[PDB]
Amino acid sequence: PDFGDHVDTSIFGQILEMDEGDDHDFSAPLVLNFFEQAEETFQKMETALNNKDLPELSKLGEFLKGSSATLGFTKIRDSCQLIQQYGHGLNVDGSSEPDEGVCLKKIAEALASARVDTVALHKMMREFFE
Secondary structure, eight states, X not given: XXXXXXXXXXXXXXXXXXXXXXXOTTHHHXXXXXXXXXXXXXXXXXXXXXXXXXXXXXXXXXXXXXXXXXXXXXXXXXXXXXXXXXXXXXXXXXXBOOOHHHHHHHHHHHHHHHXXXXXXXXXXXXXXTO
């Protein structure tokens, strides 16, 4: 399976080992569970944006970063890392960003990237598991 930059094959590959037989009896429910979880998190983020709660956004980013990391979903993990950082009021270089308005705008961009990358991956994973 050639998922491009979306998936770390060395990590995802280890998920696939847990399948007994060729029906993907373990990996497929797991991946499904991740997309549901992601979808829930994105909704809770979309609300957190609406209420301009930067700490919440930071934590949701960190949470979803961790679960995408576990499965090797690199592009999603990265965008969630940015949400974590911008939620703590920091730029990519580590310098502080004191303008909340700027932070929120950067989070919005990274949330859009995350959602789009999730959808892209969901499709490929659907092709893969059929």
